[PDB]
Amino acid sequence: RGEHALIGISAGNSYFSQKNTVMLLQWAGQRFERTDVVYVDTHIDEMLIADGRSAQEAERSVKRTLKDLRRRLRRSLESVGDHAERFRVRSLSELQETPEYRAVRERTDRAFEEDAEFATACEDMVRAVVMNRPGDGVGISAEHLRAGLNYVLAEAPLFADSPGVFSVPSSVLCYHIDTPITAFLSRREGFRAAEGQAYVVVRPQELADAA
Template sequence: MPFPPETTWPGESGRGGSEVGSPGDGVFEASPFTRACELLVERGDHALIGISAGNGYFSQRRLAQIIDWTGHRFASVDLLYADLHLDTMYRACGDDAAQAARRASRALRDVRRRVRRAMEADSDVPARVRALALSETVDLPGYRTALARIDRELAEDPTVLRACEEHVRTIVGDGPGPAGARFAAGMAYLRAELPFLLSTPEVLSVPTSVCCYHELLPLLVELEGDTSCIRPGQGHLVLRPR
């Protein structure tokens, strides 16, 4: 899940797994990050769809297509939209406090509407599908446990810290606003999402989970070959439109 401003991600995918099939194959190309991720897709317990508020990729039509694809392959699907640190990100990009608050409120109103309508349009999928705001999950015991462990790893493991820092630098780039403020805001935004990127089964009490996004996250590229912080049962899938 990237940051609110529309961003072009590095076009890297399919590092470990092969393309997988499902209803909706004419719409998406699905590439698991690793062979282990491919096995989790085949198992089909749970899919997490990360949605960035303010990102035009997630139109109502695209979200309905994603729900259809995942809803025919996984037993349950959660659409998670980030509603924390948006105003901080906008302020770091140059908005004043009032402008940032208005932009964040507008972006969240819009993404909630698109998610709701997409779910209504694809209400016949076999999976249990629900929408979650990130703020609704931060008090879950699994989220708190995962975040505490991740904070320790960030403090003690230079590899994990470097991976997160490089992820943020890749995303925020040379955009508007002071570089230091953008980086700090990006790190706060990423930290809030890390429990889901690295340990969704623990957070949501599901057996296994696959995070689905349309590009391979830079964080995963940085952690490749040193994935001890990614908990067992956590998978990643690049679900890209054909």
């Protein structure tokens, strides 16, 4: 009955096992006319470099991480299967090529420079991304924050304006608790995401509860 859902899958987010992916896909497949699945493949290497890996190590790591993500996502779509084409699944890097994304990104970039609330909110999200990053790093530096900012600004068109990114009248961003987007969503209040933009918390036991 709903118009559009977005399921964003970060290489970090350990919620996205095959089991959890399948249930979420099924849940969305039942509730939404269209669903985009976007896996975030961009800017990860910069964070590994912040942590102190060489460029070559970081590109090797990212490649591997993304291979694992894609294989698992392919397995998840198989497990739903006989209408997997019901989902449009793209990398963020592919999405970034589209005019739809670019037009929105113009707007979010500008908002970040020009709107104090939005910038603080993004920055809070940056800290959540950093503080929750893969691997054995503990300390933050200016380089982590820069990496995180690049990462978060790339995502921002999707969390600010999915209607415009995906060309739909309304879009529900599905998120899990304790993820970096929840740091953006909690930041102090009169700013508004695009009309039609919504954010729906998905709790695995409520999924299983409904299915």
